[PDB]
Amino acid sequence: SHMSTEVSEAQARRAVADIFNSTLASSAIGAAWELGALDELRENGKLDVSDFAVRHDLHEPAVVGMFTALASVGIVRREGATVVVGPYFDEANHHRSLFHWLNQGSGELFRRMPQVLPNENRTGKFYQRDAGAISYACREISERYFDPAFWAAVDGLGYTPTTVADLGSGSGERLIQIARRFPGVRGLGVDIADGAIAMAEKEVAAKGFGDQISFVRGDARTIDQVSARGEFAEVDLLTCFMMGHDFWPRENCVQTLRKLRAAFPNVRRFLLGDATRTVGIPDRELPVFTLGFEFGHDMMGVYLPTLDEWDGVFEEGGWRCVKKHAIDSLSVSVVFELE
Amino acid sequence: TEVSEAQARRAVADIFNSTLASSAIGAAWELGALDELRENGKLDVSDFAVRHDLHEPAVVGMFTALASVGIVRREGATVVVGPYFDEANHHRSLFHWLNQGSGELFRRMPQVLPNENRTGKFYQRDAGAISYACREISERYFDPAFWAAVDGLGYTPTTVADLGSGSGERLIQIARRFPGVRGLGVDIADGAIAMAEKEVAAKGFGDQISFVRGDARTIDQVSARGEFAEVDLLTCFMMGHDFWPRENCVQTLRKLRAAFPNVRRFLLGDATRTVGIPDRELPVFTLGFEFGHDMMGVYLPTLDEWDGVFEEGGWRCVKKHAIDSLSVSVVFELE
Numbered sequence: 001s002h003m004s005t006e007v008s009e010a011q012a013r014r015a016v017a018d019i020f021n022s023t024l025a026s027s028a029i030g031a032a033w034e035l036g037a038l039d040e041l042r043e044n045g046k047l048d049v050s051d052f053a054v055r056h057d058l059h060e061p062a063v064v065g066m067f068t069a070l071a072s073v074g075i076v077r078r079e080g081a082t083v084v085v086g087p088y089f090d091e092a093n094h095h096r097s098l099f100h101w102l103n104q105g106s107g108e109l110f111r112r113m114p115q116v117l118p119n120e121n122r123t124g125k126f127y128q129r130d131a132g133a134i135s136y137a138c139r140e141i142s143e144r145y146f147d148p149a150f151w152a153a154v155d156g157l158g159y160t161p162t163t164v165a166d167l168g169s170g171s172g173e174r175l176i177q178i179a180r181r182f183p184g185v186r187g188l189g190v191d192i193a194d195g196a197i198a199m200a201e202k203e204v205a206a207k208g209f210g211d212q213i214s215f216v217r218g219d220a221r222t223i224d225q226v227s228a229r230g231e232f233a234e235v236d237l238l239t240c241f242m243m244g245h246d247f248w249p250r251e252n253c254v255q256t257l258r259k260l261r262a263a264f265p266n267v268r269r270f271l272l273g274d275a276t277r278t279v280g281i282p283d284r285e286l287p288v289f290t291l292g293f294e295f296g297h298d299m300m301g302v303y304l305p306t307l308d309e310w311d312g313v314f315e316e317g318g319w320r321c322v323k324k325h326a327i328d329s330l331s332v333s334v335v336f337e338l339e
Numbered sequence: 340t341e342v343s344e345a346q347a348r349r350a351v352a353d354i355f356n357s358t359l360a361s362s363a364i365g366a367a368w369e370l371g372a373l374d375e376l377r378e379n380g381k382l383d384v385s386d387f388a389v390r391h392d393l394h395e396p397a398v399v400g401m402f403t404a405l406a407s408v409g410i411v412r413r414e415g416a417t418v419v420v421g422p423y424f425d426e427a428n429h430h431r432s433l434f435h436w437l438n439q440g441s442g443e444l445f446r447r448m449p450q451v452l453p454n455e456n457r458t459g460k461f462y463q464r465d466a467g468a469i470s471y472a473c474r475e476i477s478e479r480y481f482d483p484a485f486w487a488a489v490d491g492l493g494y495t496p497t498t499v500a501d502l503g504s505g506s507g508e509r510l511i512q513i514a515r516r517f518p519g520v521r522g523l524g525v526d527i528a529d530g531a532i533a534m535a536e537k538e539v540a541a542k543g544f545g546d547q548i549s550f551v552r553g554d555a556r557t558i559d560q561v562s563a564r565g566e567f568a569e570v571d572l573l574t575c576f577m578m579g580h581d582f583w584p585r586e587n588c589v590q591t592l593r594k595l596r597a598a599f600p601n602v603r604r605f606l607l608g609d610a611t612r613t614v615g616i617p618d619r620e621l622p623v624f625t626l627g628f629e630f631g632h633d634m635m636g637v638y639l640p641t642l643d644e645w646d647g648v649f650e651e652g653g654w655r656c657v658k659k660h661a662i663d664s665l666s667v668s669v670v671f672e673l674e
């Protein structure tokens with residue numbers, strides 16, 4: 001029953017108030033996550049705010065503030081010095097990486113909406129986001145949302161892989177997990193980020209797989225320029241998650257897919273997964289994330305293909321699509337099994 | 340806490356979209372959108388992006404963000420005011436303050452809460468943005484009570500000083516109302532002074548109104564003491580909370596008393612900390628003001644705390660005005 005055009009002054013006051021407080025609740029969700037509060041609430045159902053502030057060595061008045069902000073829209077409920085989980089807790093906590101993405105990750109971009117929209121201002125470094133924050137969030141996003149379909153696609157391969165290349169390798173947590181599934185397999189991540197390489201080289205070393213897995217600086221759109229080219233010949237599983245839209249526009253993508261094909265000519269399966277642009281979802285029925293993903297990419301000047309556009313580009317790219325998975329609850333997100 | 344899993348999905352999605360709405364309101368304001376919607380009730384997003392020279396797809400996003408929570412309604416490339424437009428638009432400066440002025444603060448909630456980090460410049464805000472909003476906040480929420488206090492002063496001022504003079508607009512208006520008056524602005528920010536002086540000069544009040552850098556907390560250090568002695572009306576809006584904690588406010592009030600010994604009336608308007616409002620009935624702003632200041636480590640007195648400090652501070656409160664509708668806000672007439 002949402003969609004009315006006619007409301008009382010009471011309702012309108014209340015609604016504009018909730019929009020205001022949601023703003024704070026929404027920033028608080030990502031913050032509370034990162035400070036270990038959501039976890040503890042998930043684990044114990046309850047928490048004493050004073051004891052929290054002490055244990056974690058936090059300024060207590062703001063801690064009160066963070067919880068009151070979560071309480072203002074029903075994520076938690078306050079009783080005395082106690083915070084309990086609220087009716088909206090599980091849902092919010094579930095999607096906690098998405099709010100973090102929105103606020104801590106991408107907060108600056110959306111804050112400067114009045115400066116980002118005007119054309120004259122659109123060149124060089126016309127926006128900023130917190131790459132450490134994004135990273136921190138995209139890690140849980142990849143796990144909470146993409147893993148099931150990722151693992152499902154891995155199950156239905158028809159072969160044990162021997163050498164896997166992961167594009168947008170990042171933390172290396174995709175490749176690390178591969179090694180753990182397929183004992184003897186070798187890994188190879190590719191990342192534009194200098195910092196992601198060392199974070200990954202460190203990550204790998206720490207988890208047992210030092211001589212199994214290595215990384216390289218490089219960019220899918222010019223993967224043929226990359227000096228490790230010669231070793232791509234032995235790769236028989238390729239993977240690429242949450243960056244496919246940055247291959248776009250279409251012709252870039254076609255080319256990028258063709259290059260990928262030639263550069264990895266013994267790849268049997270290529271697992272590609274990403275969120276896509278939605279179409280025709282009504283303004284007042286938008287689910288979590290959708291609006292921020294699409295809006296932020298518009299504000300960054302970055303094109304987002306629809307599912308159909310992905311469908312329409314693979315044959316041209318030199319790939320056959322043999323299986324597709326829908327992601328649960330992250331806009332219209334998908335995993336394609338290509339060969 | 341008994342709701343369906345669909346209830347919870349929808350509520351959580353509203354919080355998320357609300358975030359983007361909220362930021363959008365101040366954006367829309369600043370870019371002319373809200374005003375063009377108030378005047379005509381409609382707008383064409385292509386037309387509007389073109390005239391304003393904006394990247395259209397971001398413009399659409401911005402208007403979708405607003406429609407996602409009922410502020411506006413989209414019908415093609417036509418944007419129409421929605422059920423919550425009047426109210427949103429009314430409080431637009433407050434959303435601006437939260438987002439454009441103070442977004443960097445609340446964003447870094449994880450880095451700002453831990454005590455170890457809390458030294459030096461531990462948070463950042465956008466002084467230009469904040470100033471932009473404070474202008475309207477002053478005018479939409481404080482002015483009615485402000486002018487009512489001016490109307491019942493029982494004297495006609497001859498020299499007025501305004502602490503946190505900002506853009507100079509308070510002193511300007513005072514001059515438009517009392518032509519003979521001299522005006523004196525105290526602001527701690529060089530850039531407030533520069534703006535105000537420029538603004539005062541352009542409008543022709545450059546010979547009546549002038550400015551000095553100073554912190555009202557240390558008003559006794561501001562070496563323009565002779566001009567201060569001539570002042571018979573003192574104004575201070577939206578910063579009294581910054582005189583607290585209590586001991587500090589007592590001292591500041593006593594120094595203000597001394598620095599302006601011929602002030603007859605002293606107008607002090609501020610928002611104050613609320614008490615016992617239920618979490619799910621917090622009105623607009625309250626949570627922002629209070630939570631933001633707890634994050635900045637700045638004390639907020641209650642009303643009663645203010646009422647109980649003036650005598651020790653060297654003043655007698657003779658009149659008090661309630662404000663609509665800015666958390667619990669107030670104007671004291673002190674003497």
Ligand SMILES: O=C(O)C(=O)Cc1ccccc1
Pocket residue numbers: 134141242243274275
């Ligand atoms: O931040 C970005 O640029 C993204 O595109 C983030 C993203 C992509 C896919 C799923 C979730 C987030």
Ligand SMILES: O=C(O)C(=O)Cc1ccccc1
Pocket residue numbers: 542543544545546
């Ligand atoms: O010095 C002057 O310019 C004035 O006459 C003062 C003034 C100018 C313009 C409007 C009101 C007062």
Ligand SMILES: O=C(O)C(=O)Cc1ccccc1
Pocket residue numbers: 469476577578580609610
């Ligand atoms: O921004 C601050 O730190 C303020 O104190 C802002 C303010 C004070 C009183 C009313 C509205 C905003």
Ligand SMILES: O=C(O)[C@H](O)Cc1ccccc1
Pocket residue numbers: 310311312314321322323324336
């Ligand atoms: O067009 C599609 O739907 C996807 O590109 C993948 C796919 C195609 C055919 C059968 C299954 C999956």
Ligand SMILES: O=C(O)[C@H](O)Cc1ccccc1
Pocket residue numbers: 645646647649656657658659671
């Ligand atoms: O105590 C109060 O309510 C205010 O400090 C000011 C006031 C006092 C007495 C009569 C009127 C106003």
Ligand SMILES: [Ca+2]
Pocket residue numbers: 001002003004
């Ligand atoms: Ca309804």
Ligand SMILES: [Ca+2]
Pocket residue numbers: 381382383417
């Ligand atoms: Ca029109």
Ligand SMILES: [Ca+2]
Pocket residue numbers: 443463464465
């Ligand atoms: Ca800032």
Ligand SMILES: [Ca+2]
Pocket residue numbers: 643646
């Ligand atoms: Ca009282």
Ligand SMILES: [Fe+3]
Pocket residue numbers: 245246297
């Ligand atoms: Fe992206």
Ligand SMILES: [Fe+3]
Pocket residue numbers: 578580581632637
């Ligand atoms: Fe303040």
